[PDB]
Scaffold this active site. Structure first.
Site, PDB file in Angstrom:
ATOM      1  N   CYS A  80       4.955   7.661  -3.724  1.00  0.00           N
ATOM      2  CA  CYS A  80       3.733   7.985  -4.439  1.00  0.00           C
ATOM      3  C   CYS A  80       3.122   9.275  -3.910  1.00  0.00           C
ATOM      4  O   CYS A  80       3.589   9.870  -2.938  1.00  0.00           O
ATOM      5  CB  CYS A  80       2.714   6.852  -4.303  1.00  0.00           C
ATOM      6  SG  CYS A  80       2.064   6.680  -2.622  1.00  0.00           S
TER       7      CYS A  80
ATOM      8  N   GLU B 251      -4.305 -19.313  11.637  1.00  0.00           N
ATOM      9  CA  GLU B 251      -3.357 -18.280  11.260  1.00  0.00           C
ATOM     10  C   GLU B 251      -2.915 -18.504   9.823  1.00  0.00           C
ATOM     11  O   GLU B 251      -2.624 -19.629   9.410  1.00  0.00           O
ATOM     12  CB  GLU B 251      -2.149 -18.295  12.190  1.00  0.00           C
ATOM     13  CG  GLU B 251      -2.463 -17.886  13.606  1.00  0.00           C
ATOM     14  CD  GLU B 251      -1.222 -17.556  14.395  1.00  0.00           C
ATOM     15  OE1 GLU B 251      -0.135 -18.032  14.012  1.00  0.00           O
ATOM     16  OE2 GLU B 251      -1.327 -16.819  15.395  1.00  0.00           O
TER      17      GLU B 251
ATOM     18  N   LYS C 263      -2.716 -13.757  18.846  1.00  0.00           N
ATOM     19  CA  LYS C 263      -1.799 -13.463  19.935  1.00  0.00           C
ATOM     20  C   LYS C 263      -2.539 -13.506  21.261  1.00  0.00           C
ATOM     21  O   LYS C 263      -3.654 -12.990  21.379  1.00  0.00           O
ATOM     22  CB  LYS C 263      -1.142 -12.095  19.748  1.00  0.00           C
ATOM     23  CG  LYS C 263      -0.066 -12.094  18.691  1.00  0.00           C
ATOM     24  CD  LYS C 263       1.192 -12.781  19.186  1.00  0.00           C
ATOM     25  CE  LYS C 263       2.132 -13.056  18.043  1.00  0.00           C
ATOM     26  NZ  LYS C 263       3.546 -13.176  18.478  1.00  0.00           N
TER      27      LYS C 263
ATOM     28  N   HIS D  61       7.414   6.810   1.335  1.00  0.00           N
ATOM     29  CA  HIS D  61       6.457   6.890   0.243  1.00  0.00           C
ATOM     30  C   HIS D  61       7.159   7.151  -1.081  1.00  0.00           C
ATOM     31  O   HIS D  61       8.057   7.992  -1.167  1.00  0.00           O
ATOM     32  CB  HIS D  61       5.433   7.994   0.496  1.00  0.00           C
ATOM     33  CG  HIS D  61       4.368   7.618   1.476  1.00  0.00           C
ATOM     34  ND1 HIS D  61       3.232   6.928   1.111  1.00  0.00           N
ATOM     35  CD2 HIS D  61       4.262   7.846   2.806  1.00  0.00           C
ATOM     36  CE1 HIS D  61       2.473   6.747   2.176  1.00  0.00           C
ATOM     37  NE2 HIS D  61       3.077   7.290   3.218  1.00  0.00           N
TER      38      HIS D  61
HETATM   39 MN   LIG Z   1       0.344 -16.316  16.738  1.00  0.00          MN
HETATM   40 MN   LIG Z   2       2.074 -16.733  13.948  1.00  0.00          MN
HETATM   41 ZN   LIG Z   3       2.809   5.774  -0.623  1.00  0.00          ZN
END
Ligand SMILES: [Mn+2]
Ligand SMILES: [Mn+2]
Ligand SMILES: [Zn+2]
Ligand SMILES: [Mg+2]
Ligand SMILES: [Mg+2]
Ligand SMILES: [Mg+2]
Ligand SMILES: [Mg+2]
Ligand SMILES: [Mn+2]
Ligand SMILES: [Zn+2]
Lengths: 827, 827
Positions: free
Chosen positions: A252, A174, A181, A250
């Site tokens: 943009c 990770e 997960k 947003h």
């Molecule tokens: Mn994890």
């Molecule tokens: Mn994690």
């Molecule tokens: Zn955007």
RNA sequence: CCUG
RNA sequence: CAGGAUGGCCGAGUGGAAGGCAAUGGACGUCCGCGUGGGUUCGAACCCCACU
């Protein structure tokens, strides 16, 4: 819900019963503890975002108690600082416990716009992937994040796989771009739902990443979930819906939704299907992705309302007087100077009017201000109307006390005791305090106390001692915020501040302009209407003596109009004479000559220019100063003025910024200068009017421009008298008003007609422009008032016999009015 | 301890063995886990405060591992942000784990200087009271606190008691001013020594307060310490010693100690002595109190060292080129313009010299440059000398590659293989990176890779992809930091940047100056030595062309000196004649006339001033421009110049700010100007020389000034030849050098004598002042070089027929040198 | 991290 | 919306490291250690918070 209490001159939120004390709160269940904490923090966040206030909570014990560690830490997380005393101060009286909250930020343009956020939040609901963990962005972090977003791998090798083998060890841990997960056989399809809002916004906000569901977090083994417990199509639909639910904001174009790739890939055990592994790749998002709406709160109307996502982002990234904000210190030192050791009543004229009209008002006020030894008591006919509130009959006056060792107090004097008097005073004090914070930009702890006084013969809240004005620094800062607030409204003090703002602008332009004295001896100053020409002439006549060390009688001022030379003569800065007196008399002892409104001069008497040249050049100390101020937009006749040709008029200086008239007057002057340019008179060299005002210049000072037409002479008189009486009631002096008519031959007629109406308004004194020092209205012609200016001008039926002269009259009239202009043309 | 590894072009700190991975660190003991965390955080803090670097830690496993949650959180606390990726990027190959640390704050004047603190710290050791709790200020909190400190109760009713009763409930809770502590049951004096630093600094830092030791925290009962267990006088001694042991830093006078009142009172039981209760009243301290030395680290040469308390406070409260910083963007776009789509070698003159001197160097560099499709390769004879490092013989050249999709690479080219070569290149690259950060203020991720190349026949670190220059923005920012760095050292490129800074200053002063064109037809411009007079005149003729739309040949330029006439004529921006030519020929065709060096003109040939007045005033498109540039400090003769009297010389513009010469030359010019004023000439009117330069004006450009006196003629010429050879070897072109003698008659003698030494330096081509554009050294008299400028000037034996003009000839010489000036006066 |  | 995590293993402990299979975490009598990191407390495996 949380609702602000109305009976207070402040935002007071009653959060109800709260358990206070660390020991008392440890005995609570976690659910109740968190609910009480969330209530108090909603109140604190609302008050921080809404200009400050008081959180009132009834405490379940009689004796003094501490707030509680969890509440303290929630306030610390709220203000992002261990300096609680800066924003929160607590008091307790019997069953009631008060938290006094200061505003997080003040004013529309805080000094920390680019540094600190505008809002406090319980949570920004913005998550970023911080290495192998997802952490929420606090207020400052989210401020920087949005400020950035507002600027104009082996994991992929695993992701590409069409299928996975059960127990496959992934070759990477990770990281900033990967999350593993694993969920139980039972809840897999439900745990994915809660997983998405936490890791998809984080990856989107922090450069994207991969979310693998079905991978043992510790051993990195691919496990997935059993086929019997997951339907891949339903899971994919649910995950897509959850991801697209996420509120994105947003900055943009284009505004395409969150972009990601989702794969439900089979997990094979011995080649047989054991289960499904869910893999989401979250491509980086152009802007901010929220897990949910920010937990920010504000008081709007009388409710404590939660800010929406877009409104929150707007507050976090994105009539106010910028000139007032700029000059607040000078304006405060001018109008609201705090004296060393006595209480000053201002405005003094209005105070005198009030005590004269009302018997016992003086004794009442002086007996009431006994406790205060230093400060200022700012009177007004009604601070309610000053702040755009409704006028209350029966209110004699409102006085805002700003004294040392006391909180600000808004006094309301009633001729007779009224039930609604205290409500009116509280409304006015609350409005004043909220403006002092939100518009005046006061960053200190402020409370305006509402206190009603009755001339005819709920308890107040006790604030901390940090809300009292300790001394000069606090009083001056509060008064400068009051200056900024007043400059946002139409009132007597607002107009006085606007006059001083115009004077400060004129002083700035004169500082830029006076550097030409060392550089020039002859100088033709071409000033536009309202550009300060005559003020510059006066200041230059002062600087000429300051520099050349010559006595004032050595400097000469020549003007066409007798009212102007009388006005300049009473300044004692020079000798001032008219064109005709200049030609007739001898001035061989004069070294320097300043000539103003030279475009109004005439050649019929002699060569005034040649005389000035001779006198100045024949001076003993080199060639004396010969400055000729003129404005071709304000020509007053069709004949040649004796000035040299335009090509000969050098060296030149140009006063193109208009600094003598308020914004409504200045825009009107700019508009009418175009009309003048469209058809100049034949005596005006065509190339002279090609001077243009500064394109982006504005005064930032409010004015008035009312054009009333099709009215008769009597109607004009009555309207002028009514306006004059309304001004004088508010406290404007008669020497602020001028009535300018088309021509002198009409001056006597209009004087009689205006007196006929003003005898109903209790002032029967009018004067020609030759007297400008007396406290009286000035009625005269537009031309005879050239060079002079007044705050309020009534322009009556502008007119001339020749259309070749007519256009300049409206400019020559509007340029005389500093703030308020009333024009009554023909119709 | 932690030691910086020496063999890298970066600060690489080897923290040794560290357990990485969350499971692995969980299996550890807490002491070992915390020690490893402390080592890594010390290294990270040192690298953040020292300009960034790399942390090397050997990991006990082969497979990739996550860093660990505790380490991640410590980094988050270190940078006060969850944006770890901004400052930390981790790589790992084999049993080695790297953290690449970016500089926290970079540059002597960071753009965030007023917002973020300069230092990262593990702990500030600054504590404040937050209601009922003591909180440690993070770096940002401590920054704000020190900034605030730098600018220029019933607890008392209990404290006044000389005795207390066991079990007595104190009527008040803990608060911002009160703390209740119980005594430890085991080690009482040690407990008091431990507790004092926790609470006394916090009270001292926020408004003071009371610390009651011996009072139950929960019930507020007074318990005290049993008499048999504590000796009150010994406890008082321990407490006072601990309180005075606290580090205090003062931003004021007087620097008083911590003021407090310590009472050890009897805690009776049923009226008989049972124990003692300790109460300290800590009065508010004027400044910062630390509980211990701040836990902040930095790299001192080769060691990682902790900052002392006062050093930390200094760094937290507060040659660097300010003009370079201001103009970095323009200077970069001028010199280090990053090209689009090809690789640029600069400086081209030096590159050609290198490839001509060394066989195969072009092929070598071109072969090495194939991978890079875009960027700039900045050559130098020795970047080590450019950065004040010691020169290494055998180095053909150093080239700094700054290319897209690549980290900065410092190439060192050696004529033959050398063991030291890599050490020299690595030292130079490390110095360059540290300068780019700490002095150039580069706030991105920078690494300079050192590579040695050899003309004849340790493994490098692999940096994260974020250290590669992504494109135009990254390369431009890096090159602008390089501009700022170069401007702080003596070198070819630094001197070129200084020339550009002088040009930019001249352009700004001209933007101020040119606004007089719209305002003046006739103007006398009075410049000071080195004020830019002739550059301004050239630019004003260029501007006249546009603003009056007249053809260039309609503008005339008149000057006394033929070399200046030629130099101006070479640009074609006007017609340029000499005073004699102007008087002899006819110029009715001319509209505008600009006259330069008017103070050197003479009358014997005619009335040039009257002729110019006539020509300009009878211009057909109205009267034209007649601008007369003059500098009375550069009066070349004692005769009458024909200029109008000083009283008549109006309107007038003054160019007082010296913008044409480096700082040493400018200061020497000012001193010579003062001497000139002390001995004014008889042909200069009284007020001519009362023009003074701007008092606090500086050029911010580095130069050189050596007055090598007492030398003979042959020694002077040999020194000049040696200096010229050194400059040319370093890369300066000969056209940057001028040799100026006292008079034109000695020009031939000095030409012979200078050639006698220059023929031994492999160049023989001298030039006359009339051939400025040629690539030759210009040898001519001071008088004939008036109006001209060259980067390096050699003034030889300044002298005049009448010694009265010697102070003038000295100025006329010193004002011709832009950066480097060598004067050889008489002995 | 696992789980009701 | 809520629950767990203790020594070699099974497992007792919610504010002064049992027991069962001579010892059976560690650093230098103090301190750390009861999933990790912090906090409160005179005192934490125990209470509070965050994380896993
Ligand atoms: Mn994890
Ligand atoms: Mn994690
Ligand atoms: Zn955007
Ligand atoms: Mg167990
Ligand atoms: Mg248990
Ligand atoms: Mg413990
Ligand atoms: Mg633990
Ligand atoms: Mn306590
Ligand atoms: Zn001090």
């Amino acid at each position: 819900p949380l609702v602000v209490e109305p009976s207070y001159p402040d935002l007071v939120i009653n959060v109800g019963e709260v358990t206070l004390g660390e020991e008392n709160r440890k005995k609570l269940q976690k659910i109740q503890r968190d609910q009480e904490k969330e209530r108090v923090m909603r109140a604190a966040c609302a008050l921080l975002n809404s200009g400050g206030g008081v959180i009132r909570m009834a405490k379940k014990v009689e004796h003094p108690v501490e707030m509680g560690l969890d509440l303290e830490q929630s306030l610390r997380e709220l203000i992002q600082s261990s300096d609680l005393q800066a924003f929160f101060e607590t008091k307790q009286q019997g069953r009631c416990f008060y938290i006094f909250v200061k505003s997080w930020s003040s004013g529309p343009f805080p000094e920390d716009r680019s540094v600190k956020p505008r809002l406090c939040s319980l949570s920004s609901s913005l998550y970023r992937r911080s290495e192998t963990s997802v952490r929420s962005m606090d207020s400052r972090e989210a401020f920087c994040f949005l400020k950035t977003k507002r600027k104009p791998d082996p994991a992929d090798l695993i992701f590409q796989k069409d299928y996975l083998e059960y127990g496959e060890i992934l070759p990477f841990p990770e990281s900033q771009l990967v999350e593993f997960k694993q969920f139980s056989t039972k809840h897999f399809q439900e745990y994915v739902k809660r997983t998405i809002p936490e890791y998809v916004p984080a990856f989107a906000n922090t450069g994207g990443g991969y979310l693998f569901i079905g991978v043992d977090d510790k051993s990195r083994e691919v496990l997935g979930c059993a086929k019997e417990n997951v339907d891949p199509d339903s899971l994919r639909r649910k995950i897509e819906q959850a991801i697209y639910k996420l509120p994105c904001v947003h900055f943009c174009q284009p505004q395409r939704p969150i972009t990601f790739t989702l794969k439900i890939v089979n997990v094979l055990k011995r080649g047989e299907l054991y289960g499904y592994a869910c893999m989401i790749r979250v491509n980086p998002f152009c802007c901010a992705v929220f897990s949910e709406a920010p937990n920010s709160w504000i008081v709007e109307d009388k409710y404590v309302c939660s800010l929406t996502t877009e409104k929150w982002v707007g507050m976090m990234t994105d009539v106010y007087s910028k000139k007032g904000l700029e000059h607040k210190k000078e304006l405060q030192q001018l109008l609201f100077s705090v004296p060393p050791g006595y209480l000053r009543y201002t405005p003094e004229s209005l105070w005198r009017d009030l005590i004269s009209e009302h018997r016992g008002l003086e004794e009442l006020i002086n007996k009431q201000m006994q406790p205060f030894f230093r400060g200022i008591l700012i009177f007004s006919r009604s601070w309610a109307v000053d702040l755009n509130l409704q006028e209350k009959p029966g209110v004699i006056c409102d006085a805002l006390l700003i004294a040392q060792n006391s909180t600000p107090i808004l006094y309301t004097i009633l001729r007779e005791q009224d039930a609604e008097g205290q409500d009116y005073c509280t409304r006015t004090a609350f409005t004043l305090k909220q403006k002092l914070v939100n518009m005046g930009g006061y960053t200190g702890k402020v409370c305006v106390r509402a206190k009603v006084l009755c001339l005819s013969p709920v308890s107040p809240m006790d604030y901390p001692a940090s809300y009292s004005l300790a001394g000069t620094q606090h009083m001056e800062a509060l008064l400068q915020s009051l200056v900024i607030v007043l400059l946002g409204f139409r009132s007597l003090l607002s107009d006085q501040l606007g006059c001083e703002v115009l004077n400060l602008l004129t002083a700035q332009q004169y500082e830029i302009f006076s550097r030409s004295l060392r550089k020039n001896r002859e100088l033709f100053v071409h000033g536009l209407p309202g550009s300060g020409k005559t003020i510059m002439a006066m200041k230059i006549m002062e600087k000429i003596r300051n520099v050349f060390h010559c006595e004032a009688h050595r400097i000469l001022y020549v003007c066409e109009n007798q009212p102007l030379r009388n006005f300049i003569s009473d300044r004692n800065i020079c000798r001032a004479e008219t064109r005709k007196t200049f030609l007739r008399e001898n001035f061989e002892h004069i070294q320097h000559i300043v000539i103003d409104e030279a475009q109004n001069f005439r050649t019929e008497d002699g060569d005034w220019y040649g005389k000035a040249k001779s006198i100045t050049r024949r001076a003993k100390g080199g060639p004396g100063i010969l400055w000729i101020f003129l404005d071709y937009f304000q020509t007053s006749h069709l004949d040649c003025s004796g000035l040299p040709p335009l090509s000969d008029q050098y060296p030149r200086e140009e006063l193109t910024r208009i600094v003598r008239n308020a914004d409504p007057i200045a825009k009107y002057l700019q508009k009418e200068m175009q009309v003048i340019r469209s058809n100049p008179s034949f005596n005006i060299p065509t190339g002279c009017l090609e001077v243009f005002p500064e394109a982006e210049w504005s005064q930032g000072v409010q004015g008035t421009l009312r054009i009333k037409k099709y009215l008769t002479v009597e109607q004009i008189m009555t309207c002028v008298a009514d306006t004059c009486r309304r001004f004088f009631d508010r406290g404007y002096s008669p020497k602020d008003v001028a009535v300018l008519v088309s021509t002198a031959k009409e001056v006597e007629h209009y004087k009689y007609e205006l007196l006929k109406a003003m005898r109903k308004k209790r002032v029967v004194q009018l004067s020609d422009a030759c007297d400008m020092l007396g406290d009286h209205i000035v009625l005269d012609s537009v031309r005879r008032f050239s060079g002079l200016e007044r705050s309020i001008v009534f322009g009556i039926h502008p007119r001339t016999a020749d259309p070749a002269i007519l256009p300049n009259v409206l400019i020559c009239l509007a340029s005389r009015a500093k703030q308020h202009l009333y024009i009554f043309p023909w119709g």
